[PDB]
Design a protein around this ligand. Structure first.
Ligand SMILES: *[C@@H]1O[C@H](CO)[C@@H](O[C@@H]2O[C@H](CO)[C@@H](O[C@@H]3O[C@H](CO[C@H]4O[C@H](CO)[C@@H](O)[C@H](O[C@H]5O[C@H](CO)[C@@H](O)[C@H](O)[C@@H]5O)[C@@H]4O)[C@@H](O)[C@H](O[C@H]4O[C@H](CO)[C@@H](O)[C@H](O)[C@@H]4O)[C@@H]3O)[C@H](O)[C@H]2NC(C)=O)[C@H](O)[C@H]1NC(C)=O
Ligand SMILES: *[C@@H]1O[C@H](CO)[C@@H](O[C@@H]2O[C@H](CO)[C@@H](O[C@@H]3O[C@H](CO[C@H]4O[C@H](CO)[C@@H](O)[C@H](O[C@H]5O[C@H](CO)[C@@H](O)[C@H](O)[C@@H]5O)[C@@H]4O)[C@@H](O)[C@H](O[C@H]4O[C@H](CO)[C@@H](O)[C@H](O)[C@@H]4O)[C@@H]3O)[C@H](O)[C@H]2NC(C)=O)[C@H](O)[C@H]1NC(C)=O
Ligand SMILES: *[C@@H]1O[C@H](CO)[C@@H](O[C@@H]2O[C@H](CO)[C@@H](O[C@@H]3O[C@H](CO[C@H]4O[C@H](CO)[C@@H](O)[C@H](O[C@H]5O[C@H](CO)[C@@H](O)[C@H](O)[C@@H]5O)[C@@H]4O)[C@@H](O)[C@H](O[C@H]4O[C@H](CO)[C@@H](O)[C@H](O)[C@@H]4O)[C@@H]3O)[C@H](O)[C@H]2NC(C)=O)[C@H](O)[C@H]1NC(C)=O
Ligand code: NAG
Ligand code: NAG
Ligand code: NAG
Ligand code: NAG
Ligand code: NAG
Ligand code: NAG
Ligand code: NAG
Lengths: 128, 133, 105, 133, 133
């Protein structure tokens, strides 16, 4: 299974800094990365970066190197294999050119060559 | 290196735990379990001793009637019926843990144990028919 | 920098052949290629990863092939729901997903 | 198919019973034999448990010192002395049952168990002398 | 021939004793050790029975996690670190007895038991990677 409910689709104006939430269920939140993907209207879809709900190790594209704060809090065990978690997304020197739909997607596998690959996506959120 | 210890990779992937099988193999019969006094602690310990050797040989007996005597990883000729689990390899050995894998394969575990049992009775009958020349 | 096909189409029953290539920066013999079915402004879907391994549940008509200079994605036996926009991606095990331009089918 | 059950082919020919050996192999240690209370039924059951594992390993020990560890049908290098039984193959494997066969071969059963024992001590000494290069 | 008996070559050279291993192999579980009465001699005998099967399987377990199941003489891939004993072959197998050899190798006996344990976990992982084609 797996679900990743995202935050609201509210809008602000340039210069600000917004927070996007992603709430997970039905899967062990710590066993897969959490990716942030952006589908702007005036650019091809961009991979922003992934983060580890277990190791805390984050990795973003150099286009977002010093402009994004990715944070996740610890999970809440529901069963032996089910937990609930959350992931957060931020932008610093923000303008109105960063407009589009934002998604959160968890990793594919736990090991191998396609560990972090965005496999399970959220419903997306509309921006400014 | 790593050496997670006894059952250390219980939360790891099935492929990673499949490299530390001797860790759990050697701890199936030793532990700490010299006269036999029949006290409340003595009858207790005597039971803990006999139970351990019983469950150890039941596994080694099944390992024998499948042609896997003294093996940690033996391969068979029984092919994987997809109705057991249609999951792919890369989403099992790099994804699932042995605990949840046993949770979903538990239904067909008695079916698989029969297919390996006669495949070994027929393989040793073929090996005799081949060395008859 | 990862250019896809401009566009293309077919008909119900036939097949498609999308493309995806680039320079030595993101392609190809030392990278893995993933293909995402992505309706515009909706929940995407992983179709193929590691230059031909389908995701759990993808139809066996979806297929991937990688040459030493370009990666392909065939879509055999077309059906109505195939009218989406597809994107390729080039990644390694410890990097990001450099997406592709786009292909309307 | 057939599946005569545990000891089902006890009245069958030796060749037919030689195809249902796993049936009797798996029923040598399980059965029905969790605390150890020392009652009249408890001391009884405890004996039934220890006796079963003892006789099981005595067979597996002999199976080991003959090079047949984990085998239902192993072949040896000890040739058949006709003084044991001059009967022909087709009048044994398509004629006699394992019960009457054990009745007439019972005399030389201790002789045969020694020939296989040293043939295995010499075969593993030859295997070491061959891998010394 | 000779047949020195059980432990008969305890004072012989290691190479000579290495030809009478079945003599001590068969006397590790039989002996003389039918109801279980809990008397002073009965609780005694019951302990002597359970202890024998315990120590027998501990050896066979180590023999298993080294790939030597059912072997009297198996060879390994673990090479001899000279810091264990710098003695030459002709001054060991034609000179020392197994008792004094165990006296001087006793220190590193736990080190050697680990090298063989992972060499068997890696050999069976390589055998699986080879039959995958
Ligand atoms: C418990 O459960 C968790 C979650 O499932 C397990 O954590 C996961 O472990 C697997 C296996 O190790 C990880 O997969 C690997 O991912 C790495 C990518 O990480 C690399 O990239 C980082 C950012 O680029 C980099 O900083 C790292 O470098 C060091 O820094 C971090 C800082 O925290 C440090 O913690 C690291 O240990 C590094 O020292 C890091 O290198 C990827 O490189 C791996 O691919 C290699 O290995 C595979 C085989 O394993 C091979 O096929 C490839 O070709 C390649 O050679 C591998 O994919 C995964 O990322 C972890 N996190 C998840 C899934 O969220 C944990 O292991 C479990 N523990 C137990 C005991 O069960
Ligand atoms: C208990 O003990 C009894 C007695 O010893 C065993 O019965 C014997 O079993 C053996 C093995 O099966 C029999 O040998 C076979 O004989 C058949 C010949 O019978 C065929 O011919 C009949 C008349 O022509 C025909 O009607 C039969 O067809 C059916 O009809 C009967 C009606 O009752 C039905 O019962 C049958 O079952 C048939 O369905 C029958 O076909 C012969 O064909 C066999 O040869 C084949 O198999 C051998 C290997 O087994 C092979 O080498 C050959 O090349 C060929 O392929 C085989 O010789 C014997 O006839 C039985 N009766 C005796 C000996 O009196 C019984 O099996 C034991 N049971 C147990 C559980 O131990
Ligand atoms: C207990 O401990 C003692 C002492 O260590 C052991 O005695 C030693 O045994 C070894 C192995 O058998 C002996 O080595 C052999 O030596 C002979 C040389 O002896 C020959 O020469 C004598 C004089 O020339 C000759 O008279 C002998 O012939 C008979 O006469 C004596 C009379 O007492 C009789 O007792 C003999 O038994 C003979 O029947 C004798 O032939 C040498 O020939 C041997 O070499 C052959 O064998 C080796 C392999 O074993 C092979 O490699 C060679 O190529 C060759 O084929 C062998 O070297 C040693 O001499 C004994 N004495 C010592 C060391 O002082 C005793 O065995 C131990 N017993 C137990 C139970 O542990
Ligand atoms: C992200 O926000 C948290 C909020 O307290 C802050 O502590 C952290 O330093 C921020 N990350 C970076 C890289 O500054
Ligand atoms: C799988 O098992 C079922 C019964 O459990 C059987 O009917 C079917 O033929 C099997 N299929 C394969 C491919 O083994
Ligand atoms: C196993 O059997 C139970 C019977 O209640 C069923 O609910 C469950 O879905 C089965 N699991 C599998 C994997 O077939
Ligand atoms: C058969 O055994 C006897 C002793 O039981 C022996 O004397 C004889 O040489 C043996 N013959 C064969 C051919 O093995
Ligand atoms: C076995 O020994 C007994 C001794 O009384 C003898 O009567 C019998 O004939 C012998 N059987 C065989 C098959 O040699
Ligand atoms: C021998 O063992 C020691 C440690 O006991 C180790 O440091 C050394 O490298 C080993 N040498 C060889 C040749 O195996
Ligand atoms: C074994 O260890 C003891 C420790 O007291 C030491 O005295 C002895 O020399 C050692 N033996 C060998 C062969 O290393």
């Amino acid at each position: 299974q797996g679900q990743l409910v995202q935050s609201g689709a509210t809008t602000t104006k340039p210069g600000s800094s917004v927070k996007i939430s992603c709430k997970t269920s039905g899967y062990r939140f710590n066993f897969y990365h959490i990716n942030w993907i952006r589908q702007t209207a005036g650019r091809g879809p961009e991979w922003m970066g992934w983060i580890s709900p277990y190791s805390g190790d984050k990795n973003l594209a150099p286009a977002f190197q010093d402009r994004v704060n990715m944070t996740t809090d610890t999970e809440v065990p529901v069963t032996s294999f089910t937990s609930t978690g959350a992931a957060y997304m931020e932008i610093r020197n923000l303008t109105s050119d960063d407009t589009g739909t934002y998604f959160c997607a968890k990793g594919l596998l736990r090991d191998g060559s396609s560990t972090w690959l965005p496999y399970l996506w959220g419903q997306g959120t509309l921006l400014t | 290196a790593v050496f997670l210890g006894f059952l250390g990779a219980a939360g790891s992937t099935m492929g990673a735990a499949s490299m530390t099988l001797t860790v759990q193999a050697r701890n199936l019969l030793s532990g700490i379990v010299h006269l036999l006094k029949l006290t409340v602690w003595g009858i207790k310990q005597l039971q803990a001793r006999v139970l351990a050797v019983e469950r150890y040989l039941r596994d080694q007996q099944l390992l024998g009637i499948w042609g896997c005597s003294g093996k940690l990883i033996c391969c068979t000729n029984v092919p994987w019926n997809s109705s057991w689990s249609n999951r792919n390899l890369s989403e099992i050995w790099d994804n699932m843990t042995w605990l949840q894998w046993d949770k979903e394969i538990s239904n067909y575990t008695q079916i698989i144990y029969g297919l390996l049992e006669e495949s070994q009775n027929q393989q040793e009958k073929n090996e005799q028919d081949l060395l008859a020349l | 920098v990862l250019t896809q096909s401009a566009s293309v189409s077919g008909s119900l029953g036939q097949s498609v052949t999308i493309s995806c290539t680039g320079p030595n920066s993101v392609c190809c013999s030392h990278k893995s290629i993933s293909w995402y079915q992505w309706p515009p402004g909706r929940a995407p879907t992983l179709i193929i990863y590691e230059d031909n391994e389908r995701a759990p549940g993808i139809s066996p008509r979806f297929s991937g092939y990688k040459s030493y200079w370009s990666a392909y994605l065939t879509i055999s036996d077309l059906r109505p729901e195939d009218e989406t926009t597809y994107y390729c991606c080039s990644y390694t095990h410890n990097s990001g997903c450099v997406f592709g331009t786009g292909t309307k089918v």
